[PDB]
Amino acid sequence: MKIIDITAPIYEGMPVYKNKPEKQPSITTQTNGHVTESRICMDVHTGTHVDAPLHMMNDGKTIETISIEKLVRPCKVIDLTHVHEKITKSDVENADIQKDDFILLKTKNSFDKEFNFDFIYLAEDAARYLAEIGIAGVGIDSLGIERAQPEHPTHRALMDKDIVVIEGLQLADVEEGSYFMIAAPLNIQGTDASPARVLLLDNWK
Amino acid sequence: MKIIDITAPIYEGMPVYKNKPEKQPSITTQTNGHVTESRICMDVHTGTHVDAPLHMMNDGKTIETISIEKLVRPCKVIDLTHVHEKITKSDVENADIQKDDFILLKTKNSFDKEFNFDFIYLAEDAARYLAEIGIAGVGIDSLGIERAQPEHPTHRALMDKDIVVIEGLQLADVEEGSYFMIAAPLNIQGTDASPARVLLLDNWK
Numbered sequence: 001m002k003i004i005d006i007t008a009p010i011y012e013g014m015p016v017y018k019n020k021p022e023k024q025p026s027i028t029t030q031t032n033g034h035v036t037e038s039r040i041c042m043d044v045h046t047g048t049h050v051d052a053p054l055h056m057m058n059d060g061k062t063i064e065t066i067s068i069e070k071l072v073r074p075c076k077v078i079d080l081t082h083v084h085e086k087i088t089k090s091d092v093e094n095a096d097i098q099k100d101d102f103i104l105l106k107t108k109n110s111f112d113k114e115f116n117f118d119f120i121y122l123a124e125d126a127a128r129y130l131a132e133i134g135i136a137g138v139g140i141d142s143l144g145i146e147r148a149q150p151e152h153p154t155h156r157a158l159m160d161k162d163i164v165v166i167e168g169l170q171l172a173d174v175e176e177g178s179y180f181m182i183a184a185p186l187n188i189q190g191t192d193a194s195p196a197r198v199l200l201l202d203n204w205k
Numbered sequence: 206m207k208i209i210d211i212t213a214p215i216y217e218g219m220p221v222y223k224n225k226p227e228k229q230p231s232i233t234t235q236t237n238g239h240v241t242e243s244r245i246c247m248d249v250h251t252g253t254h255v256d257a258p259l260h261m262m263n264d265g266k267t268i269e270t271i272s273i274e275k276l277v278r279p280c281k282v283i284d285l286t287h288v289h290e291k292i293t294k295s296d297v298e299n300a301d302i303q304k305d306d307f308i309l310l311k312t313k314n315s316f317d318k319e320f321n322f323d324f325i326y327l328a329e330d331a332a333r334y335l336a337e338i339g340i341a342g343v344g345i346d347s348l349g350i351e352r353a354q355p356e357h358p359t360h361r362a363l364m365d366k367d368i369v370v371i372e373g374l375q376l377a378d379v380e381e382g383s384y385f386m387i388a389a390p391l392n393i394q395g396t397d398a399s400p401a402r403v404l405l406l407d408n409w410k
């Protein structure tokens with residue numbers, strides 16, 4: 001029984017989207033004696049997080065409306081580290097991908113220590129498939145699940161079929177295969193996302 | 206397989222320590238058409254959270270040094286909702302509490318939906334016993350594990366023997382007995398605590 005921690009470290013200087021200074025977290029501390037107490041400011045879309053429909057809608061469901069039963073369940077890691085530029089319907093047709101599947105995608109982003117602007121992303125063609133195939137949720141090892149797609153069709157195509165999106169996974173030391181996924185978000189209410197601790201278990205039970 | 210969410214909701218207006226209005230979380234939201242994006246600010250000791258040795262020491266370990274192997278593991282939920290004022294050595298001698306047990310304390314705090322200044326707490330006599338018995342960790346259904354104790358002897362007795370302190374649990378709907386605990390902290394580096402999503406499973410094997 002090994003736990004693989006596939007969560008991104010949160011710290012000032014961490015890889016953030018487009019390396020934008022304002023997307024960086026701040027931690028303030030105070031030590032009155034031996035008592036050390038901190039406060040953290042962070043974008044909900046920081047490192048390992050779970051997107052909610054409200055991101056890409058407006059009467060969109062929040063983080064809260066997505067049940068823990070959908071996040072603390074079995075999952076399948078798909079190795080797409082052979083993929084260049086973007087994941088296409090081709091790369092996900094040939095994989096074991098059924099209805100109510102939670103698929104985590106290990107791509108060459110798992111191996112970038114700093115932000116890469118040309119990160120492998122889930123194209124609309126790939127997402128529209130995944131939606132009509134009837135997957136439960138998709139995780140990507142990238143802070144955003146899509147780029148170079150204005151009107152955000154990838155995102156919109158998942159959250160339309162209430163498919164939970166997990167961004168910011170660190171899947172370097174993970175082998176393609178089925179695992180017990182623990183995707184535990186901060187119990188934030190009414191928001192477009194929540195930062196998450198995502199663990200894999202080799203439970204094989 | 207039933208998950209029990211024993212994590213407090215995080216929202217402006219939530220119960221915080223002594224109702225200090227500065228300990229309240231903040232959130233800023235932005236809406237370019239249908240993209241919605243948020244930023245949270247919160248005390249790392251807000252609601253359900255894991256304490257680190259740093260709080261109550263300085264050479265003491267930060268919230269990245271408590272491994273997930275001792276936070277995502279079998280737990281014992283002990284009923285002490287018959288206890289008044291404070292938990293004592295007598296109150297934790299009678300219970301099936303063993304070395305390397307992770308013990309979550311259900312008390313009258315779970316049935317308090319607002320902060321109460323007279324909260325049940327773990328007293329030094331009890332925290333010392335649990336320290337020399339060799340428990341792996343103790344969870345409390347109060348935002349703080351002690352009060353009316355200057356020098357913080359309960360904290361220190363436990364963070365001294367690398368015993369983990371988990372605070373802010375919501376154990377009203379939780380029957381005394383064994384569970385699988387997922388105490389999944391936000392992966393913030395070099396801090397005195399980190400907010401946690403704590404889940405309880407009934408897998409029993």
Ligand SMILES: [Mn+2]
Binds near residue numbers: 045143144167193
């Ligand atoms: Mn995002």
Ligand SMILES: [Mn+2]
Binds near residue numbers: 055144145
């Ligand atoms: Mn997104």
Ligand SMILES: [Mn+2]
Binds near residue numbers: 348398
């Ligand atoms: Mn605390």
Ligand SMILES: [Mn+2]
Binds near residue numbers: 256348350360370372
């Ligand atoms: Mn504390």
